[PDB]
Amino acid sequence: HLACTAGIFDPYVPPEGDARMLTQRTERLRKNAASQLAIRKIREFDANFKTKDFPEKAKDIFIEAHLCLNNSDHDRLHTLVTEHCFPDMVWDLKYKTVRWGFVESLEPAQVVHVRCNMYGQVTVRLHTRQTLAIYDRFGRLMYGQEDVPKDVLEYVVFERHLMNPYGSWRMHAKIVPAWAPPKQPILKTLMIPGPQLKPWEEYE
């Protein structure tokens, strides 16, 4: 049984300078031709789905999901996110302790584009400052700063199974814009191994 589908039905293309930017909201109205028919499909099963008010509900799930990581609330996190999202979030955090906090959001969240036997997928735009610090099994710090805020802009996709009566909005994936800055480097150092050769072979 699958309650989510990997990938995005229609990939929204973020425009450079959107962070600087009413305005963008009108662009959705201009682009409602592509998305409003999709919005109707979510509305048909729900009828309370509005692009203006959806981000608040989605934002709570996104923030809550990250909070579960601090407490390792795997059971809670499963409900918050779809099955596709969960493996990425927690697999690499095994035997690690992370302190995550949410600073005030820089800009209000707004729905960006939606494209759904029926899995409604809604793209949301979020810019928020957060704090991250990950430590080793021994407690040694390996990544992030305990009390320094980092401003991150990302687009988050939630997915709900419209057909199922029990279907609910769960985070499915995050769309990363190319203009987004690179992630912070790790504290530890890595080594790129040299070419491996047999005794007969010689270095080149």
Binding site for other proteins (CB under 8 A): 95, 97, 99, 135-142, 185, 187-195, 199-200, 202-203
Would you say 75 or 202 has its CB closer to other proteins?
202
Q: Residue 110: which of 96, 127, 86, 95 has the closest Cα?
A: 127
- Evaluate whether 85 touches 3 at the Cβ level (below 8 Å): no
What's the min distance (Å) between Cβ of 187 and other proteins?
Answer: 7
Would you say 9 or 143 has its CB closer to other proteins?
143
Would you say 32 or 70 has its CB closer to other proteins?
70
What's the min distance (Å) between Cβ of 62 and other proteins?
Answer: 25
Place of tokens 């600087």: 20
- Distances in Å between the Cα of 141 and the Cα atoms of 45, 97, 134, 178 are 47, 9, 6, 29
What's the min distance (Å) between Cβ of 134 and other proteins?
Answer: 10
What's the min distance (Å) between Cβ of 186 and other proteins?
Answer: 9
- Distances in Å between the Cα of 122 and the Cα atoms of 18, 61, 139 are 18, 13, 38
Would you say 165 or 185 has its CB closer to other proteins?
185
φ/ψ of residue 93, rounded to 5: -95, 5
